[PDB]
């Protein structure tokens, strides 16, 4: 099979600057007919892939003028003349010379912006959930940057690690931030054995963990 390699798993870029993404094939993609069968695709978070450039340098219909491609044989480059925050997504190259067609692993474009601390919100189990024997405590850590964050849960000051369900959003296309949901899953019986529930977030924006907590007894 032909192997498509996109070394960079991601590339950080600030809006307004130019940037390039590289792809290499394991075989020349030049066909006997004289065309070079290398195409580029964008897949924004939660959407289908969409063609950006076909046959190395031809922009597809509707694609922004800011894109261009170059390359030959086994080496290709996708360039942005000026990046925009809405360009977040995964960029893939694909060889369309021989079967099976094969795609590179993709390079995620990450927009760099000013640091932003998380807006942290905690939620006691809903009364509706409690009557059903459930006690999930939810914590949203929203709209923060950079993307790494850590969450610790404490029940009456003791750290709890099992039964925690964590989920992250892709980078926001308008404000370049990230958000995370962390749910402490407890049964109603377990929920009532204690009173202090804290969601503590550690992120680069503060040397002190951000703490949100409540008391069951309230």
């Amino acid at each position: 099979d032909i192997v498509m390699t996109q070394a960079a798993p991601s590339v950080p870029v600030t809006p307004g600057e130019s940037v390039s993404i590289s792809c290499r094939s394991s075989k020349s993609l030049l066909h006997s007919n004289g065309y070079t069968y290398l195409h580029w695709f964008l897949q924004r978070p939660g959407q289908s892939p969409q063609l950006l450039i076909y046959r190395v340098s031809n922009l597809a219909s509707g694609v922004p003028d800011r894109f261009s491609g170059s390359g030959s044989g086994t080496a290709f480059t996708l360039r942005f003349s000026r990046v925009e925050a809405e360009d977040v997504g995964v960029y893939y190259c694909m060889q369309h010379l021989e079967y099976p067609f094969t795609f590179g692993s993709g390079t995620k474009l990450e927009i760099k912006r000013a640091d932003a601390a998380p807006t942290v919100s905690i939620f006691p189990p809903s009364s509706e959930q409690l009557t059903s024997g459930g006690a999930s405590v939810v914590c949203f850590l929203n709209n923060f940057y950079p993307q790494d964050i850590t969450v610790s849960w404490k029940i009456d000051g003791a750290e709890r690690s099992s039964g925690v369900l964590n989920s992250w959003t892709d980078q926001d296309s308008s404000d370049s931030t990230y958000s995370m949901s962390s749910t402490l899953t407890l049964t109603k019986d377990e929920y009532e054995r204690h009173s202090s529930y804290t969601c503590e977030a550690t992120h680069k924006t503060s040397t002190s963990p951000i703490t949100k907590s409540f008391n069951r007894g309230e």
Binding site: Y35, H39, F41, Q43, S48, P49, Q50, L51, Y54, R55, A60, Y92, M94, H96, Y99, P100, F101, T102, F103, S105, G106, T119, S121, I122, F123, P124, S126, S127, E128, Q129, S132, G134, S136, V138, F140, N142, L165, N166, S167, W168, T169, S179, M180, S181, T183, T185, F214, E218
Partner: protein
């Protein structure tokens, strides 16, 4: 106006069968060579199969791992292509996209929206929806509310807020799977001047079970 629209996916039994369809419009389907590509965590995008146009004898080609199990076909009179999948395996789970090469050298120019295929013996289960309202008094300027959607299977569920009227301050997070099945949160941030004066409701749909639930977020 170009469009490709896949249908026919969803949950399927391991070792069972499922046929995906894709309806084309807005371009000359009969001249196009048409393909299926799927996406999975683990391989990223993966080419599945292709059927050529009549001029090229409707020839088919398949990736090694589905040869003999999947059959691609087309019906030019309905401008449609199909992928009949047999002997389904867990490795076949993924989103499947219909895409076409409308003319020579054009690449995969048009793609459908994608259809999730989940190969699992687990059964369909509806979600329960629980409002998430703030514990204290607001103030300050903005308040975050949420909806907990848990216990459903398979994915996906759609969540909107005020039927779509609120979308700019919403984050619907990826669902997490464990013993209780899927659990997903959606949050919405609005001015303290909007809620609780105005009704904020999360609307959840789970097409697999035909469940729809609207839950109003009320001060606790």
């Amino acid at each position: 106006e170009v469009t490709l629209q896949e249908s026919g996916g969803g949950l399927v039994q391991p070792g069972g069968s499922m046929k995906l369809s894709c309806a084309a419009s807005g371009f000359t389907f009969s001249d196009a060579w048409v393909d299926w590509v799927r996406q999975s965590p683990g391989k990223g995008l993966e080419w599945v199969a292709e059927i050529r146009n009549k001029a090229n004898n409707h020839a088919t080609k398949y990736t090694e791992s589905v040869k003999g199990r999947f059959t691609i076909s087309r019906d030019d009179s309905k401008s449609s292509v199909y992928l009949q999948m047999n002997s389904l395996r867990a490795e076949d789970t993924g989103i499947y996209y219909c895409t076409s090469v409308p003319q020579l050298g054009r690449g995969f120019a048009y793609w459908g929206q994608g259809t999730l295929v989940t190969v699992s013996a687990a059964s369909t289960t509806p979600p329960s929806v629980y409002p998430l309202a703030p514990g204290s008094g607001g103030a300050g300027s903005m308040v975050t509310l949420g909806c907990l959607v848990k216990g459903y299977f398979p994915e996906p569920v759609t969540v909107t807020w005020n039927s779509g009227a609120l979308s700019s301050g919403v984050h619907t997070f990826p669902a997490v799977l464990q013993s209780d099945l899927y659990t997903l949160s959606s949050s919405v941030t609005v001015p303290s001047s909007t809620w609780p004066s105005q009704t904020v409701t999360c609307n959840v749909a789970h097409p697999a079970s035909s469940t729809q639930v609207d839950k109003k977020i009320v001060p606790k």
